[PDB]
Amino acid sequence: DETKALKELYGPVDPTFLHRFYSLKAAVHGWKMVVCDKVRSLKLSDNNCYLNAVIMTLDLLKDIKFVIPALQHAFMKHKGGDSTDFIALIMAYGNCTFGAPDDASRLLHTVLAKAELCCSARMVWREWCNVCGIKDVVLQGLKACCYVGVQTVEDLRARMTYVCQCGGERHRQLVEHTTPWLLLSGTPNEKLVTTSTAPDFVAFNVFQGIETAVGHYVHARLKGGLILKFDSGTVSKTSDWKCKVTDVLFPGQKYSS
Ligand SMILES: [Zn+2]
């Protein structure tokens, strides 16, 4: 059966999927990954800056594997220097429109939702009320490595104190965290990023534009005491940048409360 072999290769995709993928592949055939400071960045074209941010961020995440065979194969082709299929496939899964700007964080998490981690990772949250008692919520694998809604590890680990259900005060706090890396994403947040403080994070994405909208994105990496800014095929370096941060990538966690 045609349907079955397709689902095997691409996962449970909708009827329009193959036409959208193949077409995107034709459309993005002119795009190019260029070498910038010895790494690959997607050269700006057709509002594709969000894809540069997505793909350069993915390239920093060791131990990920895609559970969809076509996506894993394209991913390995990309790692080997031929990124057309991967670009077109993530645009297809993301329901992206060629030539339109799009939301890099949203797409990044849509892509990672199709991935698994090739090693153990665990995140354990403790909830406890003075009435209800205790319960632990355990996330494993790739899900333990990503979190939306905060952009610092201090915030992530901060005890939360809320209104329960019965009427007693309920508490929530991260109590164990072991990962190979940690991706935190939030809404565009103006920060002065500086390498004099020597930050804990190793990379972050930057949103340019009005913060209610889909914007334009710059990928940034920390290296050699500098911020390396990859603006869709061009690289520049700075010690200091006032910018709106969205995604922030941290090294592996090894934490117990
Ligand atoms: Zn309670």
- Dist. CA 171 → ligand 1 center (Å): 9
Burial of 223 (0-12, 13-18, 19+ CB in 10 A): middle
214 C-alpha to ligand 1 centroid (Å):
39
Say if residues 102 and 110 touch (Cβ distance below 8 Å): no
Cβ(151)–Cβ(186) below 8 Å: yes
Give me the resolution in angstroms, 1 decimal: 1.9
Copy the structure tokens of residue 88.
């077109």
d(CA 152, CA 133): 29
Separation of CA 156 and ligand 1 centre (Å): 22
- Give the Å distance between the CA of 72 and the centre of ligand 1: 44
Centroid of ligand 1 to alpha carbon of 172 (angstroms): 12
CA–centroid distance, residue 129 to ligand 1 (Å): 5
Cα 241 to Cα 54, 70, 227, distances in angstroms: 20, 38, 8
Contacting residues for 123 by C-beta, under 8 A, at least 6 apart:
138, 139, 140, 143, 144, 145, 147, 174, 176, 177, 179
Selection from 180, 109, 184 nearest residue 148 by Cα: 184
Tokens of 157: 């680990």
Residue by residue, DSSP assigns 128-158 as EETTTEEEEEEEEGGGGSEEES-SSHHHHHS
Distance 131 CA to ligand 1 centre (A): 5
- Alpha-carbon separation of residue 118 from 60, 65, 89, 108, 180 (angstroms): 15, 7, 22, 18, 10
Please indicate the experimental technique that yielded this structure.
Answer: X-ray
Q: What is the CATH topology of the domain spanning 122-257?
A: Jelly Rolls (2.60.120)
Judge contact between 89 and 66, C-beta under 8 A: no
Q: What is the largest CA-CA distance in the chain?
A: 62
Closest CA to 203 of 40, 56, 50: 56
What is the full DSSP assignment across 160-207? EEEE-SSSSEEEEEEEEEE-SEEEEEEEEEEEEEESSS--S-SEEEEE
> What's the start-to-end Cα distance of the chain, in Å?
53
The two structure tokens encoding residue 160: 């939360």
State how far the Cα of 235 lies from the Cα of 37, in Å rounded to an integer: 7
Per CATH, the number for 1-121 is 1.10.8.1190
Rounded to the nearest whole angstrom, what is the distance from the C-alpha of residue 127 to the centroid of ligand 1?
10
Q: Where are the domains of the chain?
A: 1-121, 122-257
